[PDB]
Subunit: 543 residues, 3 copies
């Protein structure tokens, strides 16, 4: 059965790769353990906090925390849906602490970031058409969403090498404290939705699961742990500084939008489908019904500022230098076809440049239905983009706009949805646009790193096998757990105990509404700590 | 230089070199892919391939792959293969030496072990060629072209490549494969001549594996985890695994039993296997009979059918349910009709009724004068994955006080037999979860209890798998290099058996799904010690 | 018992080092060989002790003008003809562009960084001499090396020597999909490769270097339509791979259709069907004009069924003007080697065509198509349809349709179709010296390659090394020399086809890649040595 040339080609110490001594491991028994928590409503703005205390003589070690949430049935009228990954967006903060203090904590967004390359984790936290499409209730008793459980993997450093990295409790009490975002963050809804009643009646219903380990004659040794912390820059300020950086493993930079100067209302939302094209199509779809109207004489029901034009016989309406081709089939003899030529329009001066959403269409074809008295659109040529779909409606009607701005029908305006997702990066719903033009990191007062493209994000996505990375400077390339991490290391004497970030943002057109979306600079630092287990668990910052 | 002046600036302790390694020399060996045709036997007269590996120059092996030749399929009717056809072929696999069975597995259990291996699943046969339902129009028409599929037979010997490989100490290994009846892998309609197919079909297998020829092999013993399952009785919420002495893991799930039906179904989506795909195939098969454009009252439907003309406002009220039907370009001599009771079920006369027509809220379309048919544009409905998983015979069983299936004979004859051996839950996606609570008892004591599938969450999480099972894992130690950690019995105290009780969700007797029977499946992973003194042997740890 | 602690471990203090991401600009010379662009980067910093993780970035220019233009998917990898890492002792490692790509083909994120977006890869159309077809863009190419397998452990040590990374770029026509209207002559003149090299450098305090091994791939391409290839001086190989490439030299490299960014088999097929449909069913007032004379365009009968021999095409268009009829083009593409032979007729691969004529746009809007078009059909060069072998005219499409055909010169195509789906190797034989080392009647070696590497684009691969990398000396197939076993010879038998299918005339080339084991030593700087 072997070929003759192999057997013919077949003193030195030789390591055996066909057998190995199956070592007896530490004696232990694992258990999936679940805890109800205690819910308090204080800290801050009466924010909801869950606390779980872990102390059992048979739990010697734990890891792999997973948080459960019961989502209630949602009944009533209006449009309602959950943000994708709803269970993660719920989370404002997680702390693991002993009686000596805090062992490890994370900001909601950073936990989410760390799990973003984990499709399973993401799926478990709630990503489904059931949960994330925008349902509409038609009756005060109609069911919008059914009840549901979501599961949030609270990834910890204790999970890297399973039992080797687990958290050893000894005889100490470990408290896990979870702070929840306000339910407004996790919910997408329209004006008809009675959010006021929903807000009062909604309660967070959490449960903390984990893998406990009952361990005979546990042999503890000291370990190291990376604890993340982040600094949020002042609004639109292109700088932030992290103080007291003594032994850090990595440093990440990114941008968030800030929508406080707005009502957080958006024209459209794609629902469960989350691709860039989904976002764009959802937006086109919402505009199409005011964009091309089939009507008995001039269309009614629009603001006087609307400029609705009858389409010439050759199908071309000319909006300044923009040509829009409109051919609708099966149009009644008493009716004509109209193009709305300024459905949304923005400018900071009269008689200057204009951002006009209607000029972003070049062809609209479709067929009229006599049966349902509507136009069924077939093919659209346009240049709508992910930004357009990310513009809050408030910006269209702002005092900086010389135009009325929002010339949609009332019916369309009613369909607008509030979106308060807490984990948005960049300035568009997909973090597609790169608004950072240059990044500088200084250790003390000396330049540590500088780049003119996102070469650090490319390396981040590569080394972590992620397609949603960040501009990240990684200092630790040493394998976790089995080594002490490599860290950038302070002088303190020479002033080098702080990392300072300066980015150059690219500047947008002041006549595009996107210019007025506020930006925030997020800098996340991972500091090395030593873990000791001598009478209670404790950590110690490495200097 | 290019190294910034800060990194250079801040640069006698005992250190590990992370910038070089000692290249230690491995065992001198040489690998080879080997294929074998083996021998076939047919003794319910199930086919059994057996392959003997006897060669003094093969020290070890792993990575078994079984290939199967699928023959050309000629004739009339509708015919496709079940997704991942290769795995559904396999009833049982066993690896034995002269000293008995070294490792064996049920077909469904090997499928489950491979379910997160996309490549393995794709090689086994997942393609529109294989899995879309084709239709033959003449007795000499070709329905399916000859294909060859490859089934990766995952074994404990692959976990750590050469370290885990099954060693052969001059012993004769026999790999024995038991095949499900070909009924199980074929989705067909009534017009297909399955009788002739069933007798003409022959499983044509070849077993390949990676053999290793090793000089001066140095054998050591290892351990192996051998799966075992129990199936509770029909509709019992309990099942028990006896003789549990050293288990590494326990998993619980549910299968449906359709033995009380014909295993015929109204619709099937073919190669496209998403939940939305199943639903859409179903809505599509119903729509032919649901909304009819006709010259006077539509004909060819049973008398029990309630087909009514759509009023000029487009709304038909089926009891409390309002259906909107508006069709464009309908001829002046024709009207739009709606079948208000396409499928309907009830257990007591003039009481509660489940009526599939009521799960439509809006149906829009345009009549084609050129093809004499209605082309539908938008359907608002509430059909779900369960509706698509109902055997037709349940619509027409004696419990139904109605006729039940009010479809056209044209619709009825397109129904399909599905006999997939590996269905789970009570719907084709395994979406619906009918376990409301699960209890595992080691003896009289409760070992585990959960109120939601947190055990499946961990299973999926810890194995990176989208389709896990409610699984209790006892071993968190790395395989091969460590004696697996087990849960250990106490025979003295009756603690040598694992009993599982679940609380099934309570369903409505006026929904056909209520009558789909279910079985509890409990799989236990028993720890065995593999010994190599005079041949290969295994011993169940006690 | 004596038990190993699985609940805690000693934290070893590692070598003291600091890593830095380092980007460099290169020297570009358009010398070597056919005036091919070369980019040289010199790493000569005394404080860069080790490096790995090479990333090449490319600034792609704005593209202005007229016509249809797009970039091949994963454009950055397709740009690379060859990468070579060398030192003042010669070459340490080097790879051919296709093999680098092959090595990265299951690294989705690497592929995405290289340029795989609708911005890049859909075919765009410029409407005026100053219309912008593509915006400027920067892509990132992960030059994977043996030095990244085990991070700092596997890293390239510089040892106070001067490292030079050399990148040879394919001509830009390889990465561009264009029509005839696009001014490629000008573009070809003005386009310049604008490359920057990044890498992770390591400042190591008191580095303790040791020797190691390294697999260096090398390949042999057979002559056109010759089913054999030999690799010489094979003394210590860790693997051997066999695949097939098409040769399109007998050809203008033009194809009827291309799907764009969407790259699924079904996308290729639908893009094709859409292109044929404009000529396949025609709503016309009187017999359609503008077609070649060899075209057999017939009016669809009232029954709706047109019969092309034993092939029936059902065609119903809705809402057709009273003064026009519906026609079917019964031989849009046809191929036969004799007058009394089997004919391959693309119209016969359609069974049903429905749609609706639009009065407003005066064009037919197709609704549903029953057809049997396959991936091969879409991968047939137009030339082969009109080759001398074809006793028919071949291409009976409209002139408007033929204007839209696209040049494609992607250097990394394999097999004979655009998804490498069809296997054309029927039998495979591998000989070490004169003795058969391996043979197979089915693609079991490729099934294993896909299985063992978790890949759906594998190759027929003989793996000799099943030993963990870096931490052990790799297991190799080992020469004898005295018994003539210093040669790896591959012979394939290609599967046979009916000679009346155009794809039979696609020229094939056999590709054999051998991974030879090298020893890395660090005496007078870095040095590699071929194991014998
Ligand atoms: C998966 O097994 C391994 C991976 C990496 C390192 C080691 C090691 N140090 C000892 C034993 N096994 C190892």
């Amino acid at each position: 059965a072997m070929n003759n040339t192999i057997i013919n080609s077949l003193s030195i110490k030789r390591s055996n790769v066909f057998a190995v001594d199956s070592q007896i491991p530490t004696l232990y028994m694992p258990q999936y353990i679940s805890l109800s928590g205690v819910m308090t409503n204080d800290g801050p703005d009466n924010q909801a906090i869950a606390s779980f205390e872990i102390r059992d003589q048979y739990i010697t070690a734990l890891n792999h925390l997973v948080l459960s949430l019961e989502l209630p049935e949602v009944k009533g009228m209006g449009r309602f849906g959950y943000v994708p990954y709803v269970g993660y967006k719920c989370i404002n903060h997680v702390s693991i602490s002993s009686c000596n203090g805090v062992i490890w904590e994370i900001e909601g967004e950073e936990l989410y970031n760390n799990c973003i390359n984990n499709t399973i984790a993401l799926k478990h936290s709630g990503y489904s058409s059931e949960l994330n499409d925008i349902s509409i209730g038609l009756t005060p008793n109609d069911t919008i969403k059914e009840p549901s459980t979501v599961y949030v993997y609270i990834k910890t450093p204790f999970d890297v090498e399973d039992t080797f990295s687990s958290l050893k409790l000894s005889d100490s009490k470990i408290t896990v404290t979870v702070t929840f975002n306000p339910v407004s963050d996790i919910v997408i809804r329209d004006s008809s939705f009675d959010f006021e009643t929903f807000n009062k009646e909604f309660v967070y219903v959490p449960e903390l699961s984990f893998i406990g380990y009952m361990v005979k004659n546990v042999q503890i040794k000291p370990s190291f742990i990376e604890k993340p912390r982040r600094v949020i820059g002042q609004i639109n300020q292109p700088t932030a500084t992290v103080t007291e950086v003594h032994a850090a493993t990595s440093l990440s930079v990114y941008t968030k939008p800030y929508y406080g100067n707005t009502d957080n209302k958006f024209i459209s939302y794609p629902g469960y489908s989350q691709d860039e094209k989904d976002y764009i199509d959802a937006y086109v779809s919402r505009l199409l019904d005011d964009l091309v109207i089939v009507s008995d004489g001039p269309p009614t029901g629009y603001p006087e500022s609307a400029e609705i034009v009858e389409v010439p016989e050759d199908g071309i309406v000319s909006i300044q230098d923009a040509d829009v081709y409109v051919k609708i089939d099966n149009v009644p003899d008493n009716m004509s076809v109209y193009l709305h030529t300024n459905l949304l329009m923005f400018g900071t001066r009269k008689n200057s440049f204009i951002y006009n959403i209607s000029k972003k269409f070049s062809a609209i074809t479709g067929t009229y239905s006599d049966a349902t008295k509507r136009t069924i659109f077939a093919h659209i040529s346009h240049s709508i983009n992910i930004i357009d779909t990310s513009i809050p409606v408030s910006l269209w009607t702002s005092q900086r706009n010389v135009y009325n701005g929002d010339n949609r029908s009332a019916e369309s305006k009613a369909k607008d949805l509030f979106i308060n997702d807490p984990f948005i990066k960049g300035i568009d719903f997909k973090n597609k646009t790169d608004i950072i033009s240059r990044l500088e990191v200084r250790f003390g007062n000396d330049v540590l790193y500088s780049e003119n493209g996102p070469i650090s994000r490319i390396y981040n996505e590569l080394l972590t096998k992620s397609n949603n990375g960040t501009r990240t400077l990684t200092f630790n390339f040493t394998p976790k757990i089995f080594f002490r991490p490599t860290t950038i290391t302070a002088n303190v004497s020479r002033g080098k105990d702080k990392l300072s970030v300066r980015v150059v943002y690219s500047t947008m057109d002041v006549n595009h509404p996107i210019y007025y979306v506020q930006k925030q600079l997020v800098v996340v630092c991972n500091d090395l700590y030593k873990v000791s287990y001598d009478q209670g668990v404790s950590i110690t910052k490495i200097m």
